[PDB]
């Protein structure tokens, strides 16, 4: 596969998302870009319908790990980018923890020059006034590393982690990540052996947006697989 070639250099991203929390609707847009050389992508996501029901963080894993910086002994474990330009469909659960759960199925792929994500989201069985619908969690986003395994039944990964939302009294909001990823085309596609993403993510306001929003600056790179003397 060749995908990799697509993203050498910057990369306009799109994300569309379209969600369903107890009822509640609500629409995010996002625009920016994403530069897989270094690892980064700059975004701004704008929630279209007005005011966004749930927090901006527990959106954060949903709005494109094909940006992330793999160092280039472990370019063969990069299932993201193989799997490009025409895509792979990404699905989750993220149970949080003493409350409601989301299910969310995106399709990631190039349309155009265009990264595009787009997704479906819906969220079941949450508190009206817990963490998530009450607004209890503070504007932020702790760094984490999440483990990749392959899925080979099924040409795709997979992987599961547990966020850990700081909530606004001091305590911690369990968010558990359930990830699928299988490719769109049928092309050749990278299986990669164990390893893991480390993610940082910086979360910030534009001064002359009005909208619900969030600016989101985000680092992801791949790590965990040993680059042990004989390739060197």
Same mark, same amino acid.
């Given at each position: 596969?060749?995908?990799?070639?697509?993203?050498?250099?910057?990369?306009?991203?799109?994300?569309?998302?379209?969600?369903?929390?107890?009822?509640?609707?609500?629409?995010?847009?996002?625009?920016?870009?994403?530069?897989?050389?270094?690892?980064?992508?700059?975004?701004?996501?704008?929630? =279209?319908?007005?005011? $966004?029901?749930?927090?901006?963080?527990?959106?954060?894993?949903?709005?494109?790990?094909?940006?992330?910086?793999?160092?280039?002994?472990?370019?063969?474990?990069?299932?993201?980018?193989?799997?490009?330009?025409?895509?792979?469909?990404?699905?989750?659960?993220?149970?949080?923890?003493?409350?409601?759960?989301?299910?969310?199925?995106?399709?990631?792929?190039?349309?155009?020059?265009?990264?595009?994500?787009?997704?479906? $989201?819906?969220?079941?069985?949450?508190?009206?006034?817990?963490?998530?619908?009450?607004?209890?969690?503070?504007?932020?986003?702790?760094?984490?590393?999440?483990?990749?395994?392959?899925?080979?039944?099924?040409?795709?990964?997979?992987?599961?982690?547990?966020?850990?939302?700081?909530?606004?009294?001091?305590?911690?909001?369990?968010?558990?990540?359930?990830?699928?990823?299988?490719?769109?085309?049928?092309?050749?596609?990278?299986?990669?052996?164990?390893?893991?993403?480390?993610?940082?993510?910086?979360?910030?306001?534009?001064?002359?947006?009005?909208?619900?929003?969030?600016?989101?600056?985000?680092?992801? =790179?791949?790590?965990?697989?040993?680059?042990?003397?004989?390739?060197?």
């Amino acid at each position: 596969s060749k995908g990799e070639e697509l993203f050498t250099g910057v990369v306009p991203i799109l994300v569309e998302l379209d969600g369903d929390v107890n009822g509640h609707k609500f629409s995010v847009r996002g625009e920016g870009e994403g530069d897989a050389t270094n690892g980064k992508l700059t975004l701004k996501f704008i929630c =279209t319908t007005g005011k $966004l029901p749930v927090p901006w963080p527990t959106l954060v894993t949903t709005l494109v790990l094909c940006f992330a910086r793999y160092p280039d002994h472990m370019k063969q474990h990069d299932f993201f980018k193989s799997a490009m330009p025409e895509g792979y469909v990404q699905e989750r659960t993220i149970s949080f923890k003493d409350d409601g759960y989301y299910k969310t199925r995106a399709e990631v792929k190039f349309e155009g020059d265009t990264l595009v994500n787009r997704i479906e $989201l819906k969220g079941i069985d949450f508190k009206e006034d817990g963490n998530i619908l009450g607004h209890k969690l503070e504007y932020n986003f702790n760094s984490h590393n999440a483990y990749i395994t392959a899925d080979k039944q099924k040409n795709g990964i997979k992987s599961n982690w547990k966020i850990r939302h700081n909530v606004e009294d001091g305590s911690v909001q369990l968010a558990d990540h359930y990830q699928q990823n299988t490719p769109i085309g049928d092309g050749p596609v990278l299986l990669p052996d164990n390893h893991y993403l480390s993610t940082q993510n910086a979360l910030s306001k534009d001064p002359n947006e009005k909208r619900d929003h969030m600016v989101l600056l985000e680092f992801v =790179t791949a790590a965990g697989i040993t680059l042990g003397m004989d390739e060197l």
